[PDB]
Symmetry: C5
Subunit: 377 residues, 5 copies
């Protein structure tokens, strides 16, 4: 199955394979297998574009393999191809660690293969190309330069497994995945987990309900705050290869400015009767967002209350909550300079009252919910 | 109507078609149709510039078509042409989504065709060029690099329909459209909607009045805050093709720094007599702006008032208002750290008093109005 | 007076005209007229530099004219020339809109012609060069790239009119103009307006006094805050062509970080006797600066005072003042979160007292004066 | 041991040595010694890549030495090699200051040599290459351009000494070092110091425990705030060459945005009985973090307390603490604007009470702990 | 002493003079004088690098002179040379304004000449090279691009005069100068001023004491806040040419992020007895730093105090202090929003009490000292 290939020539970041000098370099550097040069024609707004391009001949798949020392960074790869066959063919994009998800390329048509490649730690780009595909252009470009984003249309097919990985430098990002599915089973799912997005922090991609035998479409939209100390992002399809619910999805990854999703004044009562109570106020871990606390106050405090502490943490960093305000020691409301950032869970720990005489206290809290899942540390 | 064309050569980002090597590449990549090479002369400050350039011959329009894998981004296209005809000709710029708006190119004159092209998702650039146009230069440049802006002069003609789309990366932008119109009808129009600017959020472009049989000019100026999760912007002319009010307009799109349009101390009374009241305080949705709340206070509170909550939202994200301060639970005025950002609508919800004994409360509010329509989420 | 010229060749951003290939391109693209190639010598630190360069021959002026689709942006142009004449020659730089201000180039000397050119909306660069000038180098570079500034030495001559325009992207800029003048009149000028700097907002450049028959020097230094929605800046000399006060000046335009010019606690009393009073507190419109209010308080309020509102505005945006604090409705002092930005004029509107019993109130205000004239909106 | 070498040719930032013109330049500039050109084959995804590349022949090691005036900055070097020997060979990377730590390159295999080189003050790059190594590619790239990071996999071998140095421009950085160790001794270690990271400020890299005869893996993760006045960072392995605990580690250096590790409300009592007490509250010097104080308050103050001052400092800058709040002179709690940044140690100095009548005061403090060791000044 | 030189060829930003085409350009553009091509050898890690390079022959010094229109900006020049003489030679770097300070280049050794060149306003680079120096490479690179800094090692010799000038764009910068001195005199110095750093603002570089006949070393480290309106920085050695205290020093200029040097709570009493008192609180003008005031309070105010104003200024901008808080008119302590930036001198002006009954008031102040001398305006 393996073949030998000559690889002496310097790699280019762009090839138009209908140019002789680009083709000559391509097949002495990153192309594996043989090719036949053919005249290729396809329609553009009713006009017929005609080029001579290399076509993969009958036999084993060809490959493109790049181990050269490209400039490090995250590349969007675009391969312009034309399927000369009268039947569909499939391609399995690299996506750094995919080997199951596919593109379906229709008979007698031009098609854009999108791929993603992180050049770090000697990573080697690899993709196989089936017989009858003409290769017209091959493009390597770094994304997140000059304000570009990853924007892959809804063409990625999965049947329950697959991976896409990419490195993100510091910043906050939106990851958007338009999808369509076709449920072929008689099973009704509720809270169907399609997949997860994670750094070393995990965000589940969940659909409220997928009706039996139904088809539908929607969009996943989540946000990651990349502090910068954990840059490798991993998307995994988790619902399981044999389920019978094929999805087709797109992938958009783009830098955003701060997004305050909402700001809220909230109130929570706690009744104390002799025992310590730990009351969750808010937990947005795994949601694609985090919190910022601006103000807190507790009413109903009496000498019968022995403990009343507001605690918070970044659960992706630590499961141990730290006290951010002590209403007994510090007073019934937070001072003007009090501002709690980079947390995603808040609880109130209180104690007091008796088994015969309970005390009810009321916490009020003003907080912002801000886009971006917090990373591990 | 369709023609075949050879497209083997690598596309360039700049062509001067009076250079042989540029012309040769141009007509083996992106130019459809035949040309005649002619000596072209035109005036610059009284001097006669003379070049040899390709001219579209009598017959079908020529086209420029680009499906090549250009670096992704938003391009400003400039085509320098010279109309060799003794009559005006028209061109229909691509603008990503336009096929009705035109440029009018005068007889025997040089002209700059401006176009806009978003290279994402395999988008294909397309423009037709009529017989007698000489094509002198063709330029592709990314805007919003190096602090550039889109700046098209007042030369775009519409008679009631048309579209222009473009991708904007994160940032706040001004969109300015200088216009002139001629109302050839005997009808005077009020709150005339010329068009809309939208992302997935909508801003109407409205003219207070257009006098019957009148002609006039003005400038639309609106702002978009692109968080970055919705980047595709769409301008639509909506007044209707057969109306009889031709407009000529320009388009300037440029990044801005934060613009505080004004800061205001405002007061609002509400009379309560037993029933819940929901009182709108401010709603700037669709205005090209948003709000920031700095301080609020309510006077006149008594035990007769059972509810008094200030609520706010980004209506482009959610029609459900969230409470941002509760004057009963939290006290009659907001604390120093209270600061409500990224909203565009505010209301007061209150209840109390009786059918026989009403209570009047007064809200005071300090807020900023900030340039930039908020996007959907 | 007009001549024809061949313009087939691609324009370059740098030419050294003593190189044959640069000269060949230059005279087949942007140079109008004939030249004579001559050996040119001039002194550098006592050494004689020798080059062969094109010289404008006896006859009509030559021109440089550039209408090609250069990358858009603001260019600083430098032309290195050598005056082979035994007499002075003058050149009139383009400066986008100038046709009266001049450089005076001494006999038998090297000289740097600085020019400014905004490549937007098909703008065409144009400058004439008199006989006997050798053209050594021609340089086009974008400024405000890589932290560069416009820095033209004190060599620009005006006798009372002239214009320089340039586009500035978003940011705050200093505009500095070192000048010398010779008053050839016996008139003592008081508050002599030399010129103005404006966007669509105007800053007068004023000298306190110019003594009769006097000669002097100084520096204008003003600042513009370019929000980004109005980028075209225009400098105009306004004192009048026949006045008899020639100036020579330089031009430095450079981006700055925020500059707090001063912060002040100020007090203002107002006496009320039955009628509404509108008292100006501060107005810095047209000064090259704006204001930020941090704190305000009014003492002396009694039930005899019926109105006491602090109002502010950006006069370049609106002549209608908005209330920023109401001391009656809101209380005698501003809250911690009160912060009024982007204004340049403040007034107090008050009413109360009677014709027989006046009331005196005292406003205190803390504000910053910040560099940068606010733009129109 | 030393050899002469020709070095006339300009240095390149990238060489692919299977290209004749790159090899020719390489061996007339930076390569020392002889080479034999050989056909080299190795496996990539089951395919056989074949190139002709220079191999170090039997005899003395070859060297690469670069003293040329490269653009200044910090370079990541990658050398793609292939070990043609049937035995392992070792290489000692430059790392600016290393001459003991090694890579181990397996028999008959391709390997990526990573190195680091700071081009400042005439620094000269140097690495030796043993016989039988084929050199395929040599890459010099600046890191921290375009959001790149240093990311070297876990392949660096130390047995108790070694240095790596690099220059960081202003910013905050994470330094992450995944490691594995093998303790060959019967000795049990506690608070094992592997090494230190320092600027002119020192951060110990410590392992809680290394069990006797144990092997283990973990990750060091520390942060440096580079103000910019001290840019040269030095990593030192300190545990001692003969210890018998070999480590293998990786190195990741990347820029981060502000990281609030946690925010805490803390309380501390101090009992006074006639003598001055200096009570440490918090000291995070050498931890890879610093502090920011937001609010402080002291309860229990009476006329019996004569001194109560909160003091802070950046210990890397100064061992003398400065008073940041005086609870006697200033009052029992800090004002809204009180905010103490860029410190890493806090203490309370207090005095009062008597030998017969003690007074207990309680300090409460709200502070953030922020990633980044503070530098010296 | 002056020579003629041919200068037709375009200037390059990098020359390796052992390449024929680089040398050919070099000696037809910027090199003045004759050269002899010689085989040059020197040691690098025990290996002998051999190149053929131009050597200045016996006779007058050669010169490098550059008046060409290089891209504007601040350049670091590196000249790699080799002294073929068996005696030391000296070179005088340009440094924009130097003509006394020298490098000493040892016999038979390679050496890096560092120089600084501001390309603005037609500035011409100039340096003389003595007989016997081989010139191997010549490099022109803009600093402050890509996060580079000026970093010249301790090799600049002065005996009491000399200048270095450079342009800095907006930012805050550290200027670090490691130095060594030899006092050949038995004079012991106190507060020895070595030199000054200034913009149009001045910072003295002072050494506490220089013992008689002593030698020593140390480092000057000061900071400049470049707002951007004054960008030209001048370093002057001022101690005087004949003093007999030679220094050798290096120069490091690098951009920094905000540096809070310290934050302090300070107290100051003032006794009033009928006369106005102006009490200096803090003055850091000329120190390389500035202040920011966060909070102020005065205790001891009575009706016997008629004036109590805190005043501040940027003395580099204005010698007139402005009132920043009036404790009589405004109250005994500053409000939460009070924050005074960009000042470097604070005083309290007070009046009250009588010749027979004095009043003592106490000011408390919290302020930050921040790196960066403020510039003139
Ligand atoms: O390498 P990029 O895609 O992060 O710029
Ligand atoms: O791959 P990392 O960036 O999570 O270490
Ligand atoms: O950095 P933030 O705005 O995501 O909290
Ligand atoms: O791709 P641009 O046009 O957003 O820079
Ligand atoms: O395509 P979007 O970026 O406007 O959702
Ligand atoms: O981010 P802004 O547009 O609410 O200031
Ligand atoms: O075009 P520039 O001068 O704004 O860079
Ligand atoms: O020319 P503008 O920048 O005022 O539209
Ligand atoms: O943006 P600023 O200049 O109002 O601070
Ligand atoms: O030189 P760099 O790697 O610091 O950008
Ligand atoms: O090595 P430095 O960056 O501390 O001077
Ligand atoms: O320098 P900071 O923002 O990390 O405290
Ligand atoms: O011109 P630079 O060296 O300031 O970037
Ligand atoms: O030369 P400047 O930048 O001090 O005006
Ligand atoms: O930010 P600063 O330098 O004005 O204190």
């Amino acid at each position: 199955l393996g073949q030998s290939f000559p690889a002496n020539a310097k790699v280019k970041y762009y090839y138009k394979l209908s140019e002789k000098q680009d083709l000559d370099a391509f097949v002495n550097s990153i192309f594996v297998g043989s090719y036949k040069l053919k005249q290729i024609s396809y329609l553009l707004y009713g006009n017929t574009k005609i080029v001579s391009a290399p076509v993969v001949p009958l036999g084993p798949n060809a490959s493109i393999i790049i181990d050269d020392e490209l400039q490090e960074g995250l590349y969007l790869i675009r391969i312009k191809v034309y399927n000369t066959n009268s039947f569909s063919v499939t391609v399995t994009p690299f996506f750094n660690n995919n080997n199951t998800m596919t593109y379906s390329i229709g008979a007698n048509s031009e098609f854009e293969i999108y791929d993603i490649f992180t050049k770090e730690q000697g990573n080697i780009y690899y993709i196989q190309l089936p017989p009858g595909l003409a290769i017209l252009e091959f493009s390597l470009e770094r994304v997140f330069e000059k304000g570009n984003r990853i924007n892959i249309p809804k063409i990625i097919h999965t049947s329950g497994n697959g991976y896409i990985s990419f490195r993100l430098r510091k910043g906050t990002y939106a990851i958007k995945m338009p999808y369509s599915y076709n449920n072929t089973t008689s099973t009704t799912f509720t809270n169907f987990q399609f997949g997860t997005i994670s750094t070393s922090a995990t965000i589940p991609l969940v659909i409220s309900s997928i009706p039996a035998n139904g088809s539908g479409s929607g969009t996943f939209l989540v946000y990651l705050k990349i502090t910068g100390d954990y840059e490798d992002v991993k998307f995994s399809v988790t619902y399981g290869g044999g389920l019978g619910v094929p999805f087709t999805f797109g992938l958009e990854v783009e830098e955003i400015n701060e997004l305050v999703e909402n700001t809220n004044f909230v109130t929570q009562s706690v009744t104390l009767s002799g025992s310590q109570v730990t009351q969750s106020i808010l937990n947005v871990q795994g949601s694609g967002s985090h919190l910022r606390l601006k103000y807190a106050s507790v009413s109903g405090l009496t000498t019968a209350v022995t403990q009343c502490q507001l605690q918070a943490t970044n659960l992706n960093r630590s499961t141990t909550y730290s006290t951010v305000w002590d209403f007994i020691a510090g007073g019934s409301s937070t001072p003007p300079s009090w501002d709690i950032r980079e947390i995603n869970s808040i609880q109130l720990v209180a104690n007091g009252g008796s088994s015969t005489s309970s005390v009810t206290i009321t916490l009020i809290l003003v907080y912002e919910q801000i886009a971006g899942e917090l990373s591990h540390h």
